[PDB]
Amino acid sequence: HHMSSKQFKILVNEDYQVNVPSLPIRDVLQEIKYCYRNGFEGYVFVPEYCRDLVDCDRKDHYVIGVLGNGVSDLKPVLLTEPSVMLQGFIVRSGSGSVLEDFDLKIA
Numbered sequence: 001h002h003m004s005s006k007q008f009k010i011l012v013n014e015d016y017q018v019n020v021p022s023l024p025i026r027d028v029l030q031e032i033k034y035c036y037r038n039g040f041e042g043y044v045f046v047p048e049y050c051r052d053l054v055d056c057d058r059k060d061h062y063v064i065g066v067l068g069n070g071v072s073d074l075k076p077v078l079l080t081e082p083s084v085m086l087q088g089f090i091v092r093s094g095s096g097s098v099l100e101d102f103d104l105k106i107a
Contacts, residue, residue: 011096022061028076075107
């Protein structure tokens with residue numbers, strides 16, 4: 001069911017400048033489905049207020065966005081995503097500090 005969520009532990013990055021891949025929207029949709037089944041090993045969560053830490057080659061390509069508080073939806077977004085519901089981004093990197101629990105579903 002699309003309303004059903006899962007709990008995941010993800011490394012959080014508030015401190016480190018990270019260079020990450022950004023991808024066409026259909027590839028990010030596939031990564032979201034992949035991570036929803038198998039977990040987020042190799043990704044970090046970057047809170048929206050730290051978004052300047054994140055760099056990529058193509059600013060017009062997508063990363064995983066985390067939208068809503070409590071149980072968040074996973075959706076491909078651009079790093080410039082203006083939505084007020086944006087909690088942050090999950091990006092492929094290993095730089096981070098603390099492990100946090102997230103309740104997530106696919107948009």
